[PDB]
Amino acid sequence: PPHGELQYLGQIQHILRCGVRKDDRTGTGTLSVFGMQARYSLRDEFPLLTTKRVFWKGVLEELLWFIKGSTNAKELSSKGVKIWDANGSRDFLDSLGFSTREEGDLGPVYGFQWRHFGAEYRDMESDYSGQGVDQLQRVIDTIKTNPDDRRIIMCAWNPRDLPLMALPPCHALCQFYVVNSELSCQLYQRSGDMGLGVPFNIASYALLTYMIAHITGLKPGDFIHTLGDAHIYLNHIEPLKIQLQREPRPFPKLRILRKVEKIDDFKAEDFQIEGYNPHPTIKMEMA
Amino acid sequence: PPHGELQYLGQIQHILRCGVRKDDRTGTGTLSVFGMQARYSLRDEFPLLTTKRVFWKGVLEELLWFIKGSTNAKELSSKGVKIWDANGSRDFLDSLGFSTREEGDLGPVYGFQWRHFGAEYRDMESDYSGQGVDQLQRVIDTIKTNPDDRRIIMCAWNPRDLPLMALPPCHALCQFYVVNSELSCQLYQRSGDMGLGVPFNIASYALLTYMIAHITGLKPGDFIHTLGDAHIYLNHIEPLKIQLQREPRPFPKLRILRKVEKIDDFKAEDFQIEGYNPHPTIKME
Ligand SMILES: O=c1ccn([C@H]2C[C@H](O)[C@@H](COP(=O)(O)O)O2)c(=O)[nH]1
Ligand SMILES: O=c1ccn([C@H]2C[C@H](O)[C@@H](COP(=O)(O)O)O2)c(=O)[nH]1
Numbered sequence: 384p385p386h387g388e389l390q391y392l393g394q395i396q397h398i399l400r401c402g403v404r405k406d407d408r409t410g411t412g413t414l415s416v417f418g419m420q421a422r423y424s425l426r427d428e429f430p431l432l433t434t435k436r437v438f439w440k441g442v443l444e445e446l447l448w449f450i451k452g453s454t455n456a457k458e459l460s461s462k463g464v465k466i467w468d469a470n471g472s473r474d475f476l477d478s479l480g481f482s483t484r485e486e487g488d489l490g491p492v493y494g495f496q497w498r499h500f501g502a503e504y505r506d507m508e509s510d511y512s513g514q515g516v517d518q519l520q521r522v523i524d525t526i527k528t529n530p531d532d533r534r535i536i537m538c539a540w541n542p543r544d545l546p547l548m549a550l551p552p553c554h555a556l557c558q559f560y561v562v563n564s565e566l567s568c569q570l571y572q573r574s575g576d577m578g579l580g581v582p583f584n585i586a587s588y589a590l591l592t593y594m595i596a597h598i599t600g601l602k603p604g605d606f607i608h609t610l611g612d613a614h615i616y617l618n619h620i621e622p623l624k625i626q627l628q629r630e631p632r633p634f635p636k637l638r639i640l641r642k643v644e645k646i647d648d649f650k651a652e653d654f655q656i657e658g659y660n661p662h663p664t665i666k667m668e669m670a
Numbered sequence: 671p672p673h674g675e676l677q678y679l680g681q682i683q684h685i686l687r688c689g690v691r692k693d694d695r696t697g698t699g700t701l702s703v704f705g706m707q708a709r710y711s712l713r714d715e716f717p718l719l720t721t722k723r724v725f726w727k728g729v730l731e732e733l734l735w736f737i738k739g740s741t742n743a744k745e746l747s748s749k750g751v752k753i754w755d756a757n758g759s760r761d762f763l764d765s766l767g768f769s770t771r772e773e774g775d776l777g778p779v780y781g782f783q784w785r786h787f788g789a790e791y792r793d794m795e796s797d798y799s800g801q802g803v804d805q806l807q808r809v810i811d812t813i814k815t816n817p818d819d820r821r822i823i824m825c826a827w828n829p830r831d832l833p834l835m836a837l838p839p840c841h842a843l844c845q846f847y848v849v850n851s852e853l854s855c856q857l858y859q860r861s862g863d864m865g866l867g868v869p870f871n872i873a874s875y876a877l878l879t880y881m882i883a884h885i886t887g888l889k890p891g892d893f894i895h896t897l898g899d900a901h902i903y904l905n906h907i908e909p910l911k912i913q914l915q916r917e918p919r920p921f922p923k924l925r926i927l928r929k930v931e932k933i934d935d936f937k938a939e940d941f942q943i944e945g946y947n948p949h950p951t952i953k954m955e
């Protein structure tokens with residue numbers, strides 16, 4: 384029964400062989416394919432990629448940050464995780480015409496949409512209690528009361544709020560599904576950096592599925608990863624060709640160390656990655 | 671290496687062999703798989719399924735109805751296409767607590783979202799000019815000025831408006847992509863009836879892609895169909911097993927009979943399906 388990581392590596396091989404040259408905003412260039420799908424099992428395994436070490440602390444702190452409803456990059460930065468800091472910087476905010484906005488205010492991004500979809504975004508420090516649709520909690524309620532429902536969806540893509548965001552969301556939406564006491568999740572990702580982001584993104588939503596499964600007393604099932612523009616940056620090709628030489632090691636397991644009743648109560652210390660034996664990281668430039 | 675209609679037929683075979691028995695809202699029951707994807711080429715071909723005749727007039731009138739921004743089921747019904755009528759009926763509207771709403775008012779469904787996303791929905795007859803985001807026109811503008819953009823998206827799923835809709839959308843969102851003068855489209859469909867709906871749905875978005883390609887002077891590329899809950903109802907299994915035994919005929923072509931500048935100007939008579947040779951329909955409840 385073949386290792387789950389071979390699907391990701393397979394997508395890299397497909398983009399390298401069949402992808403087409405395409406320019407982007409940074410003028411690095413890409414090889415790109417439109418429309419891909421991979422399926423990663425979550426049964427007695429957690430799909431944290433082994434051919435290159437994935438930044439696990441980042442995955443976990445960012446997810447907890449989303450779940451709090453936070454849109455303050457400084458709040459994620461306090462936890463050791465810098466991945467949203469460039470997008471919240473005075474310079475980057477000024478380049479979007481948000482001169483009046485405080486540093487770190489990303490606008491109504493993921494945290495805001497999951498917890499207060501459709502509320503009037505004022506700033507990051509504001510009180511949004513009871514405003515908008517709490518999509519995350521409604522997903523959890525529906526899994527509990529009506530698991531066979533086909534509307535268990537969480538949408539981050541909000542065309543009305545897009546002009547206020549520092550970055551339009553990659554993770555447009557995700558859908559949940561229940562059968563035989565197993566919870567699965569599909570993610571529609573409109574744009575995927577296969578070198579840097581994708582492994583991280585797989586881990587983010589695998590972890591979300593494990594958390595919701597625990598709250599609802601279900602077993603994790605599959606994570607389905609669907610991509611729109613799936614691209615490799617040209618400066619990542621040599622690093623990626625190195626990574627493709629590495630045999631994957633078995634995926635680790637994720638233990639949840641205590642019983643937890645509401646999703647708001649999860650803390651970083653509640654999670655233990657057990658058996659993670661990645662090969663060494665390879666450097667790959669971003670902005 | 672399987673192509674065209676063989677992808678759809680392949681998904682039917684996969685659900686029949688690997689799908690899991692599941693109850694649904696109606697308690698008829700289904701075989702179901704979660705997460706599927708198919709790729710249909712649009713280059714010198716139009717993916718209107720041949721193993722069972724697809725209701726072409728319905729596809730076309732409904733798409734033009736969406737594009738107008740209409741949310742009035744009676745307006746689609748006037749054109750011979752009844753598929754939204756049950757959802758706009760006085761009884762069905764009363765069962766959702768919309769006793770004050772006129773018959774046919776489906777609420778803020780596709781039409782409204784594509785043209786006025788985020789506007790305050792009052793009723794179907796109201797004037798929504800300049801209100802909300804016009805996602806359809808913004809897709810067209812972006813394809814013209816910045817084809818390499820990865821944000822060319824049209825979203826029908828609006829959690830704030832869901833409680834006002836007669837039906838929550840199947841077609842959550844769709845995304846466009848341009849490379850080498852070819853326009854492609856991916857559709858995220860959260861729930862797919864593989865027997866009745868899916869063939870129709872493929873045709874709907876293939877046609878949308880052809881229309882936008884024409885306005886933007888691009889050639890059609892691929893249509894990618896992504897599904898969430900992909901199911902076959904149990905009463906459709908015997909009919910579907912019959913359909914799987916039919917050899918597909920080549921896909922037809924779609925001609926666009928005149929030059930058209932804005933997407934609002936397309937009319938039913940502008941479109942010609944040429945070479946369509948389907949097998950006879952099979953009935954499905
Ligand atoms: O969680 C994320 C956030 C961003 N990106 C990527 C994809 C693109 O390479 C780039 C953003 O491009 P745009 O689609 O925003 O234009 O960063 C990811 O892969 N995952
Ligand atoms: O254009 C459409 C509209 C609806 N359906 C389907 C899927 C389900 O069988 C049913 C909707 O059920 P829910 O997913 O809303 O629960 O209708 C389609 O396939 N295509």
Ligand SMILES: COc1ccc2[nH]cc(CN(C)C)c2c1
Nearest residue numbers: 501502503543788789790830831
């Ligand atoms: C309060 O007005 C708003 C603000 C942001 C929004 N995003 C989506 C909607 C949809 N709504 C008009 C029903 C919205 C409304």
